[PDB]
Amino acid sequence: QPDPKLDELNKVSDYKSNKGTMGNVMNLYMSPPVEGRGVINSRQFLSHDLIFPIEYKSYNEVKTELENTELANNYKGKKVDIFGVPYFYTCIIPKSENFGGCCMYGGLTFNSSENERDKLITVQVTIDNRQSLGFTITTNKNMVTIQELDYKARHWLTKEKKLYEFDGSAFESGYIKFTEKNNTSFWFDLFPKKELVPFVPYKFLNIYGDNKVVDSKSIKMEVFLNTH
Amino acid sequence: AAVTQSPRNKVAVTGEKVTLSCQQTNNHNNMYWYRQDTGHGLRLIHYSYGAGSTEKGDIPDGYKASRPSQEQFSLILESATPSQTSVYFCASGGGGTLYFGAGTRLSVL
């Protein structure tokens, strides 16, 4: 898309020196994802979002936002599964008539009863271009959102390798890169822009709004991290 | 009560992990943890604008916070130090209004 230069990656140290708290980002990837299996939207706020009557903790619905109306219309009124990262501060979800609730981007795949062996994907992690480990994540979906993968991966690294901590990280910068079978690739900067203080969740999570879907069986995942 | 804190009194030893809990009944979006010290009045440690949000106040060093739901805002001292001896006050707020809890006295030995 193509691969980032070091100097273009967001820095943990810049985020801290702008008085930001990396714990906001930690909590998105440590707390559980929104999940729903075979659900159908109950309503909409704007024509590029779909409101789903799924439970998350004490919330009774989630608004998921798509990048444009046609993408929303691709899923509207259909049986889908939902998997994504919710936020609450800045979430705007008007009631059916009074304002806050649970929101997310993207997250959607068509529900399929022919979709039942878990696949394993090995995430390849490289640090400072010099040490590797891999771990594996699973999903039972043949066609999976990139969001689902990204979350499963960042969640393991946050819990096990200090990807995000309350006030920083074991790293200074990094990105996660996905490679599809046809050989093209894209990446996300793992860290928040230094300007994003206070942390405003929708501006970080809108990367999922394109509801990019991939084939579990063939997708390649690589993380690259730099220490300070 | 608008805002309740627990515990109300706490004696800890240096290095001990201590969590102070604040729970509100107002459905306010904003919550705050301050400490009160002679010669400073209230100083803001961390605050929150909603569930999953916490941001640094003026004296955040040595403290973490967590806002796991609308109702609850926790202040976490991972490794208590004597400089953390103080009386802590939590507040909730929504535009115009602020309600404060009754205070938590922490001595760190």
CATH class of domain segment(s) B1-109: mainly beta
Cβ of residue B55 closer than 8 Å to a chain A Cβ? yes
Q: Do A87 and B64 touch (CB under 8 A)?
A: no
Taking the C-alpha atoms of residue A99 and residue A88, their distance in angstroms, rounded to an integer, is 11
Distance in Å, alpha carbon of B20 to nearest chain A alpha carbon: 17
Nearest CA-CA partner of A139 in A155, A157, A161, A158: A155
Resolution in A: 2.0
Cβ neighbours of residue B42 closer than 8 Å, sequence gap 6 or more:
B34, B35, B36, B89
Taking the C-alpha atoms of residue A165 and residue A191, their distance in angstroms, rounded to an integer, is 12
Tokens 């800890």 belong to which residue? B12
Cβ neighbours of residue A183 closer than 8 Å, sequence gap 6 or more:
none
Residue B90, token pair as written in the block: 């939590």
Chain B residue whose CA is closest to A19: B56
Q: Do A90 and B29 touch (CB under 8 A)?
A: no
β-strand pairing of A49-52 with A62-65: antiparallel
CATH class of domain segment(s) A33-116: mainly beta
Nearest CB partner across the interface for A24, out of B52, B69, B70 = B52
Chain B residue whose CA is closest to A89: B50
Q: What residues of chain A, 200 to 219, have a C-beta less than 8 Å from chain B? A: 201
* Interface probe, candidates B29, B45, B47, B54, chain A, greatest A C-beta count within 10 A: B54
Q: Is the preceding peptide bond at A2 cis, omega within 30 degrees of 0?
A: yes
Cβ neighbours of residue A133 closer than 8 Å, sequence gap 6 or more:
A125
SS3 (DSSP) at B5: strand
The domain segmentation of chain A, as residue ranges, is 1-32+117-228, 33-116
Q: Do B52 and A201 touch (CB under 8 A)?
A: yes
- DSSP letters, A163-202, are SSBTTB-S-SEEEEEEE-TTS-EEEEESS--TT--S--HH
The domain segmentation of chain B, as residue ranges, is 1-109
Residues of A with Cβ-Cβ distance to B73 under 8 angstroms:
none
Nearest CA-CA partner of B82 in B44, B42, B109, B45: B109
Give the rounded distance of the alpha carbon of A99 from its chain centre: 24
Backbone angles phi and psi of A63, in degrees to 5: -95, 120
- The CATH code for residues A1-32+117-228 is 3.10.20.120
Distance in Å, alpha carbon of B2 to nearest chain A alpha carbon: 20
CA distances from A121 to A68, A110, A150 (A): 30, 21, 12
Taking the C-alpha atoms of residue A193 and residue A11, their distance in angstroms, rounded to an integer, is 8
Residues of A with Cβ-Cβ distance to B52 under 8 angstroms:
24, 27-28, 31, 87-89, 201
- Check if the beta carbon of residue A205 is closer than 8 Å to that of residue A154: no
State the method. Answer: X-ray
For residue A164, the one-letter residue type is Y
Distance in Å, alpha carbon of B53 to nearest chain A alpha carbon: 6
Cβ of residue A21 closer than 8 Å to a chain B Cβ? yes
Give the count of beta carbons closer than 10 Å to the beta carbon of residue A117.
10
Cβ of residue A118 closer than 8 Å to a chain B Cβ? no
Taking the C-alpha atoms of residue A137 and residue A58, their distance in angstroms, rounded to an integer, is 28
Largest CA distance in chain A: 57
SS3 (DSSP) at A59: strand
Chain B residue whose CA is closest to A198: B55
Cβ of residue A100 closer than 8 Å to a chain B Cβ? yes
Backbone angles phi and psi of A151, in degrees to 5: -60, -50
- Check if the beta carbon of residue A6 is closer than 8 Å to that of residue A226: yes
Residue B47: burial class (beta carbons within 10 Å; 0-12, 13-18, 19+): buried
Cβ neighbours of residue A190 closer than 8 Å, sequence gap 6 or more:
A154, A163, A171, A173, A174, A175, A176, A223, A225
Q: Do B50 and A21 touch (CB under 8 A)?
A: no
Residue A199: burial class (beta carbons within 10 Å; 0-12, 13-18, 19+): buried
